[PDB]
């Protein structure tokens, strides 16, 4: 309603207050809170979980293609797409006005363009799935009258769209859509830190948070070299024992990455290095390499903790926040 008032009466009492810089920050913050509300409300039917198992298909009417029901856009979905178009248009104008170089030279501009592009890719993927479902639906309504798709054997290209989630292809657009949509939603709530500098209590906290992230970035490079040393070394050791291990810890480069990454948080078990065979020499080397990796990782973390403490030891946070 406030937006409508601006169009009808740009120059009025409402116009001057709406043009205040504080009220234009509040309006932009208010619109984004609505956008996050639309994101949460879009999944409001699944807050307590889904009643239907992913193995069973439910259709609103008997002749419907199942993929039509799971890909159709709802009224909340359309609002999110429009809000993204509105947000992308603002980013495109800033890219054109400011310039394709300065635009990038800002943390928020690249992040905002990143999350809006993932939203567009998520909606583009779902749109492609919707088009495929309609093509399958078009065949049914114009060629099938076989009492709710019971006895009729559809062609394999069209029969695929009557399947449940378990029979979906691993790379079909619907799975890609919700995978990218999840990333965008997580990136969306990161924009809450865009309005945090305005507050006198949480503003300094975000300034110090960004400073630590920049400090950690240079320390990661040191730990990547340590991480890659043991990822290749332990994968090479255990690559030949694929079916001869308690688990799949270091059998592949990916599994070697997974195990060593979650060892940072203590989420990788010691049985990652245990062999089923009697080759104790290789198993004991894996114990030492995995033990050295944990000790080395602590030392790198301990060095990062101490160095960043001394960096802060040398009323400056107030100046940076203001």
Ligand X SMILES: CCCCCCCC/C=C/CCCCCCCC(=O)OC[C@H](CO)OC(=O)CCCCCCC/C=C/CCCCCCCC
The footprint of ligand X (CB under 6 A) covers 209, 213, 226, 254, 258, 261, 284, 287-288, 291-292, 295-296, 299-300
Length in residues, the chain: 322
In the complex with a second copy, the residue whose CB is nearer, 18 or 180, is 180
Binding flags for a second copy, 30-69, as an x/- string (CB under 8 A): ---------xx--x--xxxxx--xxx--------------
Q: Does 128 bind a second copy (CB under 8 A)?
A: no
Q: Does 74 bind a second copy (CB under 8 A)?
A: no
Residue 142 interacts with, from Ca ion, a second copy, ligand X, none (CB under 5-8 Å by kind):
none
- Closest approach of Cβ 175 to a second copy, in Å? 5
* Local structure of 275: helix, strand or coil: strand
Q: Does 192 bind a second copy (CB under 8 A)?
A: yes
Selection from 308, 300, 302 nearest residue 224 by Cα: 300
Q: Does 163 bind a second copy (CB under 8 A)?
A: no
CA distance 118 to 112: 10
Instruction: Answer yes or no: are the C-beta atoms of 118 and 185 closer than 8 Å.
Output: no
Q: Tell whether residue 109 is among the known ligand binding residues.
A: yes
Q: Does 289 bind a second copy (CB under 8 A)?
A: yes
Q: Tell whether residue 157 is among the known ligand binding residues.
A: no
Chain centroid to Cα 155, Å, comes to 36
Q: Tell whether residue 283 is among the known ligand binding residues.
A: no
Question: What Å distances lie between residue 115 and 7, 33, 103, 284, CA to CA?
Answer: 30, 16, 15, 46
Residue 246 interacts with, from ligand X, Ca ion, a second copy, none (CB under 5-8 Å by kind):
none
Contact segment (CB under 8 A) with a second copy among 59-67, 90-98, 149-157, 282-290 equals 282-290
Tell me which residues touch Ca ion (CB under 5 A).
109
CA distance 66 to 71: 9
Residue 81 contacts by C-beta under 8 Å, 6 or more apart in sequence? Answer: 73, 123
Instruction: Answer yes or no: are the C-beta atoms of 32 and 191 closer than 8 Å.
Output: yes
Annotated binding-site residues for Ca(2+) read 91, 94, 109
């Amino acid at each position: 309603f406030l937006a409508i008032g601006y169009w009808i009466a740009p120059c009025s009492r409402l116009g001057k207050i709406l043009r205040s810089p504080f009220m234009k920050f509040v309006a932009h913050a208010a619109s984004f809170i609505i956008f996050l509300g639309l994101l949460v409300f879009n999944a409001s039917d699944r807050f307590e979980g889904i009643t239907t198992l992913p193995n069973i298909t439910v259709t609103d009417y008997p002749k419907q293609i199942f993929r039509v029901k799971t890909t159709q856009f709802t009224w909340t979905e359309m609002l999110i797409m429009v809000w993204v178009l509105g947000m992308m248009w603002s980013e495109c104008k800033e890219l054109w006005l400011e310039g394709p170089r300065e635009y990038i030279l800002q943390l928020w501009n690249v992040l905002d363009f990143g999350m809006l592009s993932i939203f567009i890719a998520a909606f583009t993927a779902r749109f492609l799935a919707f088009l495929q479902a309609t093509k399958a639906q078009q065949y049914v309504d114009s060629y099938v009258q076989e009492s709710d798709l019971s006895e009729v054997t559809l062609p394999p290209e069209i029969q695929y769209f009557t399947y449940a989630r378990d029979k979906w292809l691993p790379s079909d657009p619907q799975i890609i859509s919700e995978g990218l949509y999840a990333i965008a939603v997580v990136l969306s709530f990161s924009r809450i830190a865009y309005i945090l500098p305005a507050n006198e209590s949480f503003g300094p906290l975000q300034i110090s948070l960004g400073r630590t992230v920049k400090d950690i970035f240079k320390f990661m490079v040191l730990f990547i070299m340590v991480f890659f040393a043991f990822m290749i070394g332990m994968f090479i050791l255990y690559s030949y024992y694929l079916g001869a291990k308690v688990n799949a810890a270091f059998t592949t480069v990916e599994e070697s990455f997974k195990t060593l990454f979650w060892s940072i948080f203590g989420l990788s078990e010691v049985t990652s290095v245990v062999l089923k065979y009697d080759h104790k020499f290789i198993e004991n080397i894996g114990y030492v390499l995995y033990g050295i990796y944990n000790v080395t990782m602590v030392v790198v973390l301990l060095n990062m903790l101490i160095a960043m403490i001394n960096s802060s030891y040398q009323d400056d946070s107030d100046v940076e926040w203001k």
